[PDB]
Symmetry: D3
């Protein structure tokens, strides 16, 4: 009665999740015709079934967004009982506030409901208030505990968590609480606010895109006395020259999760990727079986 | 082209067909609204309108052609941006409506994408739509906001009329396009014939000038096979025409190597600069759409057009 | 738990369907007061029940449409679990496109959802895109296979399927595919496009209303060499002089289905009526039990 | 009657009450919008507006009287047609609101048809409504679009005042109409009395001129029984009045054979040409509705009226 | 699987109802911060549960309305299966018609649905057409039978039911039918229409607010020949000087129900309070178990 | 103040902040719309607009401050009243947005009240909103109707600039307010420092004039503790400021007894007349909001402001 489908964004994450929960991915067909149009065909009856769709809205966001919406349409029209969306990475999440700009994080939310979505399971939205962009139920999972565990196990002396900017202090502090460490912040107006002399710095962000911000912060820490610099994020967008910039940086090791598929192309030298696979598989089971999802936060 | 005199009419162009959009604006007499549609390295689209449009009637010109998904998204984001900046109205001029084909795959559990698009456009905040030659006229019923549907057949007809042709027969490429072939046949007082690919011909095409008409020419497999079977059955000559030149895949090579004397299309879809069609004529829908926007904005009768 | 109700359009079809699935029709009351107003009263508790309403929106369409909407309102307000509409004939289906006309096929759809409908089961809509007029689930049944079977069993030599016009070629061809026959079409601008000399013609349409189109086509076929003319449609609207025109025509036999009740009044001489009763009863069971409805098309 | 001077005000009439609709248009000073509401042989209604109304404020005059289902449908289809032809506004003037009776059948699992209608009208696309003497004033709450509710009592009162009557008592036909009898009693500074059919009389009606008032007179069973019991209890005389003359079934014969001296009604519902009431007076709501449409269109105070 | 919560309006009624149906009230938290804002926190997982909320929208109506809406929001966002609202007293019910006034009874209804309500159970709405203000299911319970039983048991000779005004005649008559008594009405334009000489009068209304209307009617009855005056209503709003006015009136006994909590403050001397507790507990069970609720009216 | 000359602009005040509302109206040049918001003995709110506003653009000024529930309700009822009286637009000017705090209680199963409010306002019938210093800028995303968000920081900055201060450091009271401290630091070309209460200080505050900035000062526990720890760590002096003076509970006594040299706030929330702050300065948002309403009404650029 529970059917899980995967689309093109992150097929491997979807498979890992399916193996853990114990189902074969649903029979669907995702064709792209020669003129660029996409067509999904549900290759099996899903009438009366609770359907889960696993899709990160990563590069190319607009293709991933449309195939997800078109698939929801096909399931709604094929009489699915529920259409539950599992989103490891929420694209356009940085477009969450307005000078004559759209609020794309909100537009997508409205689009998703319009298409027929029942509920959403999300992981580390750029802003916690993005939950409020929905009127359908949404269960928000956090990735900070996963990154925090890995660092807690590295036997690092003298650490200070560093927020790459003014908007990342809250996140920095959740990590500094978990690790019992002080916080410093970069104030590119690029000044270092806080004590980092001799300390092992851990730069943290939710998303690492072009990596300009992170590598620059890293270089600044090192020439201001930091013993060493580590860097982590939940979502590895890593577009453009991101990878190169990181390989040449002073960043000892970069730690990311697998919410976004890694560039087949470019390789990161000092890197560690943690899986959110178990977290999502478990959240899917509890949502479907109506157990407590919040048991997952404490 | 500044000459319009209603500073309250704004026209924006997205990336699908900037040339057509420029032509329309020029004809109307106004400069393209100022905005920037950029794509960050991660493929996300960013839009920021560069002049206040608060209280203005805005017109967005976008064909949802290859790649349809990107063009739909920038269109939706553009509308969200104008809605939030307090535009008075957000009018959508769609020269080509992507996903309008409902039969593409002959399957069971399919989506009805042309309907999903309509719902999405309305949700984004569209006030109305101006469309041209929708694949099926009942797509108008997919909207609950006003939609004005323009016909491209008169333009094509007027062109063929000017060629002074003898013994013509309008040919429908398949079963679904007989109504459309009939409209051209009426404009040209010519009989019709249809290709029954199951590849037979219903009608007398012998020693006549055949004109193949379809709404869309995509891979060109259908139209070229229909042109060849036409000639080899005695048609003296074959012209082909359509409103929307999708021309994907091998379309061009197929056309260049076929017996089609001349292919006639409109500029509702931007042509591939890459490859050239040899025997080709392109008619413009710029004046037709420009006239439509003016009558809609000023509240004049547009049915008069079409 | 499954309750089936019938309204005034086609009580006999409703009864046949109820007998096949194995239920007594629900206890409802359809009163028309002296001033013309209608009042439905559900004569039994249907709280928590999945309710099916059988109604063709045939002559008078506006009365049939309103009693259906008022009944949906009473069931919604009486806490029905689901309100499933079974529509053998969809009136106003020819009003599916716009010069300053409404798109009544779309208006009705919106009205139906507004009133509280859960889903729809339809049979041979004038246009397949009318399915897209709904946002609630709709399962579209075809009648061509039923008419096609009957002709396949008549031992007719030399046949050609004839589309009475430009808009009926697709339908004609589905019948010509099933019967392995060529197609011809009438081009009233009234010319016959295609070879019909000595052939047995079968004129096909979805709806036969005043029958002017069909009888004229039939007369034209016969004076252009056709050995004989048969005629069929799924929906027998047959209004005005329809019947007389058919009785005097050259039409050997007219074949229709029972999606619309036959005029108690006027009688057709050479005629055959096939029942969609089994098709709908079966579609109702599969929808309710969540089996595959598409198994019914192949 | 061309004299209005705001070519932007359009008024349409459907089939329920063309005479009333003509009177209103005449008074306003405009010609009835051009359209054709035809019914094909199969009973389907076809509408096609014969002049552009794009950008115009349209007023539709339709009472949903016998047969209510047909009149509702043509009204809904008319609105869909105007919405899709780009009307600026679609204003509904309903002289008589069908299905406004909620108690007709005393059952359990009933529909609330007056609410369903409101939802349907809004869904079709109505901008606002102008109504007259709704059976229950809270039906105004059934709408989420603006609704202006006009009262017919002043017109009736003004008529009775002009008769110079002595010793009058306003009689409520039943328990639900006491508030309405009270309003007339206020206009005429007269006391009230009520018929408690369980058929007793609460109040002193002895040797007085009784005036029975109701909102609707349908089969006339209630009003005639109430008039007879009135006379036989000593009332010197009995007048009867209402806003809406539904007059279905035996209504007329019952009235003609009753003791009602004179029945007074308005023209909110078209009268049966077939049968004649003998002692009868019909007051017009044409001027009242015409004045309402003008103030709504020009944005003037209409509460001033009512 | 059935969880019942109570908010601040009438905690005792909620408890009585919970005891009868056989559940402990749900674990929720209703905090009012120092600046006046309210925060509800569901202290237990209610995922997949049918939740009932017991709240009268009595003084202060706006606080009671908001805490109810905020609670519905928290349950909707915490994935409740259904959110069923039980409303013993419906505030703003007198704002049911429009000169440039709002129709607050309708606004609240729209607000309730917007917040996420599934259905409503109501008791004696000011106007029966207020049921039509909703599009979600609503089951309307009557209190007249409860007041009527109590009077039927008092051995009162010569009774006449009295409507305090023009709008209360229908209600008066339902009570006069149950008791086989004649009706009289007060016509404050303050005249007494009907025979009350020597009779025992029972003044009836739905709501007794400031009690000016009722006490004045009572005084008028007594100086016009009435042997004695009784007074009843379903909803005891009793605000301002209500209580004092009643204690000094000629009203022999005032009978009310417990749909609204009684002023802790002021005491009524000759009074009787009947409980709607059993009625609501029973309606809750039948709604939840899908039995017939209308069995409760006859 | 009658001088505006667009009889079509109406401005109403509810009970949250009548003084601010009066100031705005005065500046604009119009008299407060006429209405009565009364509360019957039972606490129900009654509203009845005393002049026709049919066709007028109406502006409602209401802060949803203590008690937020009453103020929200009168606001919602006011909108229902204007919608039903046929106002053309219903524009909401919210100087202070109650329930904008999402972290107040650190629990699991919570409501998102700021979102519920937005949905309710839209449902009531709001056309648009004008807000000032929302607690989180993404609350703008909670609305699907246009919302113009004004910033109070420039006003505060301009005041501090006029004091001619030396060696200043802008201090963020907590982790969530670093972006806001940064904006003031930009206006004053000053570095920033943050209080890491887990109560340590990140940044050099030694011998400097510290300026604490927050959006809201409620019980004042956070700001006063942050001011004290500042001084005892060597800050030469401490100023404190915020846009919204909620000042609930012991706020005032705490401030009066702290080391804050001067507390600066705006008049977005009505101050308690009861208790006085000793070292205090109140800047007005009346001119800022008045300018915003005019540009919105006349369709001028308001981003120019903020």
């Amino acid at each position: 009665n529970l059917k899980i489908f995967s689309l093109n964004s992150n097929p491997e994450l979807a498979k890992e999740i399916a193996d853990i929960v114990g189902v074969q991915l649903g029979k669907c067909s995702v064709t792209r015709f020669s003129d660029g149009e996409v067509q999904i065909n549900i290759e099996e009856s899903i009438r009366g079934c609770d359907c889960y769709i696993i899709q990160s809205t990563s590069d190319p966001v607009n293709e991933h967004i449309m195939e997800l919406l078109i698939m929801v349409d096909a399931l709604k029209r094929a009489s699915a009982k529920t259409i539950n969306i599992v989103i490891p990475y929420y694209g356009y999440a940085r477009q969450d506030r307005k000078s004559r700009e759209p609020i794309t994080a909100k537009l997508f939310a409205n689009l998703l409901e319009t298409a027929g979505a029942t509920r959403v399971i999300a992981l580390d939205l750029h802003a916690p208030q993005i939950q409020g962009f929905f009127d359908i139920p949404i269960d928000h999972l956090m990735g900070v505990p996963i990154l925090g565990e890995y660092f807690e196990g590295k036997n690092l002396e003298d650490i200070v968590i560093v927020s790459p900017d003014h908007g990342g202090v809250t996140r920095a502090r959740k990590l500094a609480d978990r690790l019992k460490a002080p916080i410093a912040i970069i104030d590119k107006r690029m000044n270092i606010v806080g004590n980092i002399e001799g300390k092992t710095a851990i730069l943290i962000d939710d998303i690492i895109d072009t990596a300009g911000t992170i590598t620059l912060a890293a270089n600044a820490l090192v020439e201001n006395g930091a013993k060493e610099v580590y860097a982590c994020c939940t979502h590895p967008v890593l577009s453009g020259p991101a990878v190169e910039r990181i390989n040449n940086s002073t960043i000892k090791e970069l730690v990311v999760t697998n919410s976004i598929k890694l560039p087949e192309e470019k390789k990161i030298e000092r890197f560690k990727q943690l899986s959110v696979g178990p977290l999502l598989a478990e959240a899917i089971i509890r949502v479907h079986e109506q157990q407590s999802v919040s048991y997952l936060f404490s």
